[PDB]
Amino acid sequence: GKVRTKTIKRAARKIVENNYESLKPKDFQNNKAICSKRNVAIIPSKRLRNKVAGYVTTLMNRVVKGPVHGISLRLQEEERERRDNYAPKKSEFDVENITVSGATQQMIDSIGFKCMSTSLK
Amino acid sequence: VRINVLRDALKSICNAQRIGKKQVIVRPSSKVIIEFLQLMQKNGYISDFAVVDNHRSNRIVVNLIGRLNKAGVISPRFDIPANDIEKWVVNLLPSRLFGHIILTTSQGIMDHIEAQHRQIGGKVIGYFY
Amino acid sequence: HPSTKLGRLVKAGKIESLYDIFKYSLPIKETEIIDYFFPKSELAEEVCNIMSVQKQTTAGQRTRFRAHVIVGNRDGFIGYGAGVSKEVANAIKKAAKNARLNIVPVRRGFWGGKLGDPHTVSSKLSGKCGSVRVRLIPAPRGAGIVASPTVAKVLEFAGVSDVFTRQSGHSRTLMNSVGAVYNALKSSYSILTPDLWKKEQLDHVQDIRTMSL
Amino acid sequence: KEADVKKMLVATTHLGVRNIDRRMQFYIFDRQKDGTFVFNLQKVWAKIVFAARILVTIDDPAEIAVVANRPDAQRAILKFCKYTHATAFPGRFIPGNFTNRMNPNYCEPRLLLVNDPVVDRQAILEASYVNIPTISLCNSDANLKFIDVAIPCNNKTPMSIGLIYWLLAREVLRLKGSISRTEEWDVKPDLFVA
Amino acid sequence: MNVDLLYPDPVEEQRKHKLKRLVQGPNSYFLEIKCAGCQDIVVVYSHANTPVFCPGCTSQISIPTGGKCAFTSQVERYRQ
Amino acid sequence: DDIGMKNSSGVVVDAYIPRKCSATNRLIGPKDHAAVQLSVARVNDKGKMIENNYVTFAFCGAIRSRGGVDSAFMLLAQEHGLMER
Amino acid sequence: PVKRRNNGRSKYNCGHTNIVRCQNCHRCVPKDKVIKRFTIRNIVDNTIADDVLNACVIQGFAIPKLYNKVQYCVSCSIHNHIVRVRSREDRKIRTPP
RNA sequence: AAAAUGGAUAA
RNA sequence: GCGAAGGCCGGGGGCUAGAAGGCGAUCAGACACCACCGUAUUCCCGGCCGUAAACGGUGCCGCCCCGCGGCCGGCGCGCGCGUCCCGCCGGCCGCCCAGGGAAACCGGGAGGCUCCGGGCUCUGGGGGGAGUAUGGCCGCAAGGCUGAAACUUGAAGGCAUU
């Protein structure tokens, strides 16, 4: 049975959000170089470097398909921004509501303007 | 049986002023409960009062400016010796400087200060602060 | 640094005088702020009862020490806060820190004769903590502070020197006896009188949180 | 405004839940055939314009912070926080964000704006501890505790939360005179939707 | 809504119990019935709990009820 | 209005004086946390601008817990007039 | 201490309830302190689900179902696991699971 | 299904 | 005056359970628990007795007291016209805002108290001895009600946390 220690999981998350492009989904060794590449990251001992490498290859799989939270990617923030800042091509929601609710008519009558009284109705 | 009109009515005033309740209601009214209220309004502890004269028990309206703490009645209504009005003051008064104990004297419903100015004694009706 | 928004304002002096902060009821969580706001004799202090507290677990019983500290100045200010730590002295230090945050303004009062400057208590201020029920009753000029030896000295640091007390409950408990009195001494400003009933102030732009250095 | 009243009726903001309290009866208008309550939109405008009025009081709008844990909402708050100068505090509330001198998210807001008390009660509770006046926008069932003011609104649809947040922000900026001044709003009503 | 007990909205007093009103008094009133020979007012107790008889007839105009008394013939509202 | 306790001379001698709740007149407590001096802003309307200076309402800590702070506000600014009836 | 406000019974406004006996113990516990869980089951075990219906000559005959209320005593029930010892917080919740 | 006991005195 | 159950008196009954009694197994011993048998009893009518964890371990009337409720009994007003909706009173209840308390927690009070005072009634004063002794009284009895002292001892005891 294998479950990763917190030290491996925490560092691995940093290595997957520090470089997603550089890391590989299945090639453990490409990730292993990035894990122990001096300035990019340092793992004391090869076995720990191997431990992070196995997870960063699985985490690379996770980021590639439907990523779990807690990981940041340059593309992820920008790609999300386009969808959130996309307003409907033209907001057709307002239109003319029609079909008045039963007592809503009185509330408009009691505020000084009739919302197309008996036209939406 | 409603044994005392004043006690419940004074508890109800106090109850409203803890819940804020700017407008307060007293249901059974007696002359003494009116005389207590004029004494309170004149002091300014309560802003004003009125009574709707329904042809039964005359309900009372109470308006409180909201500056009220505790207003309770002292019954059994012990008559107090004129010399020792102060002993009752020690127990029922927050500070000798402020507060009021309404007594009943022949001259008319009078507060603690008026009584010692006239050096007179009377049955304790209640304390309003 | 100054950790709180109030703490920076205190060091800056944008809001000055402890009495002003109390007026706006701003929570004070910085120990350093009280020492800066008041350097007068710092604060006079007392270590009221460092009780022994125990938890029986498995093989042996853990023994923390719980201490209650009275810190105060005779300018209508009393501080009662407590702390418990395994080290006996460290508990006292943690208590002093707590005692600084919960310093409570005491109104102070003038008795039947306003002959001079306030030494009396305001009204018969009463507070209960735990079971100990205590009322501070205003007393004549020659009457000093009558209360339990420990409760009375809490009153002296508070600055009242004319008070009468009748505490009822398990008074042997230093923890809640000197704690119930603290509730009474703080209650001094919560109470109201006819002069205080007058509606004024509402300056609005004087909010401590609104003020920016 | 008749076109905003048409928009408010379009948002279904005039809908309510099952019951009201003594305070909420003031904003209540009527009973539908099924039985949920409905609100008079006159009450909606006074509360939202009052909220606009009260919102300019604190300099540094980050101090007038916004907190929400409602799935339909949060986005509207995240649009208001952008259009105004406020800071959103959404998702898990992190109880003790407002307190705790060393809190990762130390927060000391001067005024507070919520999506509603029931959705996250910790938010309104955290007003009492930190000396902060608090505002929320609630449906017919209203636990109005700690909240200076509350505004009747459906809070059931993303669209309803969106149009009251649009109306609030449009009024907040217009009341300031910063933009619009009752003219067509710089952003559309649909922008705040989730 | 800053209504105070001194002036309560009429509907409030009409909704509450006739003793729990700021001004207590009669819930009931007089409601007319119609009889043979009458297009005019034939007043009767609204809450009659006893038999009233057709003027100069054997049949009973109002059915007995714990509440407002019901009728079997044409009837006229309150006082007219 | 000479608010506050005084000596025979009549100067205020009670040091700090706590402010009063607008709706209940209760003194905002020395360590009371919920009670706040929040500010309400008036508008030019023709100006459509904040004028920098406006009124403040103190909501008592007790009323906040009681829940009536909202219904108290409509009345507080109804007498002031800024909020409608 | 009062572990529960109902005091262990649903007796409300009466002061007396008719007493029955545990199906198992035969202990007499008043109707209010009784488990009483209604049972409806196929008379042959569902293991003989359709083996019987395939054997049954008559067309459209449904396996008879018992509809019996089982009334157990409080003591018998906890030891037969019909209800367990809940936590202080858990006790207030009802919502038959 | 069957199971009883444990000196005092401090620790 | 009434008062569960058990008891008891004089008639009846007599199915079932079943104080006692026997019996098996049960263990060191069980004369206990678990089976089996079974008298009193259970049942009935006229009597006594007078007790209960007779409980909400919360006297009795009185009044104010915050929301969400469920049930229940009348009793209304509008809706489409339903065994609807809002409720008005008398209860039955669950959650609980204040507020109280050592707390568990009550909150339609165990809230409106040391900022103590609506009225009437009972009852207690560390823990044993002690409901004991005696003096009554009531009862066929069994027993009930009232009710000691000498003497001893430092804890007894409530709710909580580990």
mmCIF file of N, CA and C in Angstrom, chain F residues 13 17-18 20 29-31 37-38 43 49 52 55 59 63-64 79:
data_model
loop_
_atom_site.group_PDB
_atom_site.id
_atom_site.type_symbol
_atom_site.label_atom_id
_atom_site.label_comp_id
_atom_site.label_asym_id
_atom_site.label_seq_id
_atom_site.Cartn_x
_atom_site.Cartn_y
_atom_site.Cartn_z
ATOM 1 N N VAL F 13 -17.335 66.224 35.918
ATOM 2 C CA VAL F 13 -16.194 65.614 36.665
ATOM 3 C C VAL F 13 -16.182 64.088 36.481
ATOM 4 N N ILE F 17 -17.658 60.604 28.776
ATOM 5 C CA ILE F 17 -19.137 60.429 28.813
ATOM 6 C C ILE F 17 -19.547 59.488 27.664
ATOM 7 N N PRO F 18 -20.128 58.265 27.856
ATOM 8 C CA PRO F 18 -20.519 57.444 26.717
ATOM 9 C C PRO F 18 -21.682 58.023 25.900
ATOM 10 N N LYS F 20 -25.164 57.869 23.448
ATOM 11 C CA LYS F 20 -26.477 57.232 23.726
ATOM 12 C C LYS F 20 -27.047 56.580 22.463
ATOM 13 N N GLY F 29 -22.011 50.890 25.527
ATOM 14 C CA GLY F 29 -21.101 50.425 26.593
ATOM 15 C C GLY F 29 -19.628 50.705 26.388
ATOM 16 N N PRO F 30 -18.796 50.823 27.469
ATOM 17 C CA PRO F 30 -17.348 50.962 27.323
ATOM 18 C C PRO F 30 -16.697 49.793 26.579
ATOM 19 N N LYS F 31 -17.112 48.560 26.868
ATOM 20 C CA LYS F 31 -16.556 47.419 26.099
ATOM 21 C C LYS F 31 -17.653 46.766 25.255
ATOM 22 N N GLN F 37 -21.311 53.494 15.867
ATOM 23 C CA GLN F 37 -21.705 54.860 15.389
ATOM 24 C C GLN F 37 -21.558 54.887 13.863
ATOM 25 N N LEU F 38 -22.371 54.110 13.152
ATOM 26 C CA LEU F 38 -22.272 54.024 11.674
ATOM 27 C C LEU F 38 -22.848 55.310 11.070
ATOM 28 N N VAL F 43 -27.938 62.989 0.004
ATOM 29 C CA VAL F 43 -27.467 63.304 -1.380
ATOM 30 C C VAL F 43 -27.964 64.671 -1.857
ATOM 31 N N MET F 49 -24.472 63.999 -5.689
ATOM 32 C CA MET F 49 -23.092 63.785 -5.180
ATOM 33 C C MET F 49 -23.095 63.709 -3.657
ATOM 34 N N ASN F 52 -19.716 65.065 1.570
ATOM 35 C CA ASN F 52 -18.559 64.856 2.490
ATOM 36 C C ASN F 52 -19.062 64.843 3.950
ATOM 37 N N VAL F 55 -25.127 62.602 8.426
ATOM 38 C CA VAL F 55 -25.510 62.169 9.808
ATOM 39 C C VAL F 55 -24.990 60.768 10.156
ATOM 40 N N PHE F 59 -26.516 52.340 16.529
ATOM 41 C CA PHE F 59 -27.450 51.214 16.783
ATOM 42 C C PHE F 59 -27.010 50.478 18.045
ATOM 43 N N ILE F 63 -30.113 46.110 20.680
ATOM 44 C CA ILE F 63 -31.131 46.067 19.587
ATOM 45 C C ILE F 63 -30.611 45.192 18.449
ATOM 46 N N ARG F 64 -29.296 45.222 18.212
ATOM 47 C CA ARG F 64 -28.669 44.417 17.129
ATOM 48 C C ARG F 64 -29.001 42.953 17.420
ATOM 49 N N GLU F 79 -37.886 60.121 10.923
ATOM 50 C CA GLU F 79 -37.944 61.397 11.693
ATOM 51 C C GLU F 79 -36.884 62.328 11.119
#
